Amino acid sequence: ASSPQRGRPRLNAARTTFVGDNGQPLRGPYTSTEWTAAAPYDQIARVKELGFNAVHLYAECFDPRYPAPGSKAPGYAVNEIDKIVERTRELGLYLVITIGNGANNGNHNAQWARDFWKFYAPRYAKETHVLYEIHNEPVAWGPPYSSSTANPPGAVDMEIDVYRIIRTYAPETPVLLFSYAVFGGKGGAAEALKDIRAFNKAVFGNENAVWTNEAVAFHGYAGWQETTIAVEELLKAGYPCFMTEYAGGGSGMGGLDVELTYELERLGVSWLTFQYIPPTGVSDDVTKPEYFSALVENSGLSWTPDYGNWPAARGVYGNGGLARETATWINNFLTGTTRIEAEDFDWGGNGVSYYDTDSVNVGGQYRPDEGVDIEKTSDTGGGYNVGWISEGEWLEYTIRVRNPGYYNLSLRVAGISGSRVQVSFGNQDKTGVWELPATGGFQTWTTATRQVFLGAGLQKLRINALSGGFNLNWIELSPI
Numbered sequence: 179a180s181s182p183q184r185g186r187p188r189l190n191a192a193r194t195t196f197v198g199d200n201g202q203p204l205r206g207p208y209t210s211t212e213w214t215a216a217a218p219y220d221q222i223a224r225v226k227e228l229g230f231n232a233v234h235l236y237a238e239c240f241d242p243r244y245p246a247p248g249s250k251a252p253g254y255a256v257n258e259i260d261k262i263v264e265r266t267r268e269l270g271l272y273l274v275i276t277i278g279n280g281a282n283n284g285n286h287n288a289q290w291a292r293d294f295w296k297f298y299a300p301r302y303a304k305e306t307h308v309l310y311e312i313h314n315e316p317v318a319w320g321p322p323y324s325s326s327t328a329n330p331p332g333a334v335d336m337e338i339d340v341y342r343i344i345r346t347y348a349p350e351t352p353v354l355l356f357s358y359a360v361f362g363g364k365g366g367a368a369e370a371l372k373d374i375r376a377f378n379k380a381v382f383g384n385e386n387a388v389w390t391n392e393a394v395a396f397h398g399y400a401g402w403q404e405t406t407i408a409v410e411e412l413l414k415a416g417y418p419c420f421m422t423e424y425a426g427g428g429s430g431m432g433g434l435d436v437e438l439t440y441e442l443e444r445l446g447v448s449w450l451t452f453q454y455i456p457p458t459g460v461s462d463d464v465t466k467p468e469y470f471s472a473l474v475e476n477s478g479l480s481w482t483p484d485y486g487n488w489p490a491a492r493g494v495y496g497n498g499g500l501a502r503e504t505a506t507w508i509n510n511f512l513t514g515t516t517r518i519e520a521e522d523f524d525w526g527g528n529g530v531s532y533y534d535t536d537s538v539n540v541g542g543q544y545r546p547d548e549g550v551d552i553e554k555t556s557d558t559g560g561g562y563n564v565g566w567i568s569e570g571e572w573l574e575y576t577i578r579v580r581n582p583g584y585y586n587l588s589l590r591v592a593g594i595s596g597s598r599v600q601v602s603f604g605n606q607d608k609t610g611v612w613e614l615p616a617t618g619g620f621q622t623w624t625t626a627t628r629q630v631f632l633g634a635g636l637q638k639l640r641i642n643a644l645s646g647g648f649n650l651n652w653i654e655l656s657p658i
């Protein structure tokens with residue numbers, strides 16, 4: 179069809195999340211019409227060149243005082259929300275509409291929420307690119323909302339009541355439930371399942387209903403590790419989910435949480451990050467590199483975007499396509515391999531994941547159709563080495579450092595005089611100029627070692643050749 183409007187998102191076959199009309203996850207930043215005009219078309223359009231296909235809208239913020247005299251009633255921002263709906267329609271973006279909280283996160287006004295959805299559910303029912311998220315962070319700070327000691331109580335009743343209102347007027351619109359601020363651990367999943375069972379009993383007549391057009395909205399404020407565990411457990415229990423707010427700072431500040439993004443990508447979960455579309459928002463501008471694009475580029479995170487060519491296509495070679503996790507010490511032993519073969523640089527291409535001065539692999543070995551020059555090695559263990567290493571060349575390897583601290587970085591090298599490298603981690607220099615040992619021959623091998631101090635997380639290891647005159651067999655990174 180010729181309309182730019184996206185088709186309704188649907189649950190994927192795996193029932194892990196909502197995917198769009200090309201099968202791909204929804205990925206996006208946010209904006210707000212809670213006390214401002216709709217973000218301009220030209221600014222919303224920028225999301226498409228940042229790898230996104232979706233926008234989170236905090237449409238209006240609730241008034242705890244409603245319906246008392248002077249209180250702000252739902253519907254006040256209709257003219258601006260209509261513009262966001264129109265602009266995303268035209269731009270070929272998905273839109274997740276919710277109720278925001280202002281200074282009152284971890285709280286809600288049930289009557290206000292019911293009245294908001296009575297007004298807006300019918301209004302955007304037929305807008306196929308639009309999803310409804312019942313209410314942002316309605317309880318301080320996570321499950322079980324169904325507990326009598328939840329702060330405030332009764333949010334599951336609001337979820338039920340609002341779901342019925344939505345489905346009355348918008349029978350086919352995806353609904354995102356709960357919007358838990360802090361969703362962590364096996365415990366968090368078990369507590370959420372209490373809420374889910376209560377909801378299901380009330381609206382479907384069965385605690386164990388199989389949702390066809392609903393998912394659990396959750397946030398990342400338990401931290402990436404604990405959130406990943408809770409998500410994994412909920413997916414195992416058969417309930418799809420959708421990340422709707424997170425950042426790498428309980429803080430919405432600090433930019434993209436690269437670690438949690440990586441896990442969500444692995445698990446097949448759509449996500450909305452807490453960085454904003456210009457001109458304004460409460461946290462950090464998603465178009466500022468330091469809060470999003472540079473975090474992606476430094477880490478090696480990649481996904482196939484609906485629009486444009488960013489992030490560039492790339493990934494790990496070998497290791498099941500997973501970032502190469504660094505070993506740790508447990509009970510006086512190393513938990514896994516410390517060695518990365520040099521010929522296992524990330525795929526992506528010349529100028530992307532490596533740079534080689536000859537477009538052809540002049541060695542012909544191992545990866546003949548990429549540009550790094552590779553030969554069979556005569557070193558112990560056999561296999562392959564990178565050879566014909568020229569000044570200015572570089573090789574990247576996406577790794578994941580489990581623990582921050584000191585590591586021994588070793589390079590297995592062979593060569594003549596005057597060889598030097600410099601090694602970056604997440605585009606930060608960790609070695610300075612490193613004068614490598616001469617061995618007297620291109621197949622006479624030695625191990626050069628230098629201590630580095632690393633931060634945790636997904637990060638690219640980049641070897642920059644500051645000279646020629648050496649071959650490289652492998653890299654080791656070993657915790658001290």
Ligand SMILES: [Ca+2]
Nearest residue numbers: 534551566567
């Ligand atoms: Ca070369």
Ligand code: NA
Nearest residue numbers: 280281282283
């Ligand atoms: Na707030």
Ligand code: NA
Nearest residue numbers: 534536538549
């Ligand atoms: Na080459």
Ligand code: NA
Nearest residue numbers: 596614615616
């Ligand atoms: Na040397």
Ligand code: NA
Nearest residue numbers: 519520562651
């Ligand atoms: Na090798």
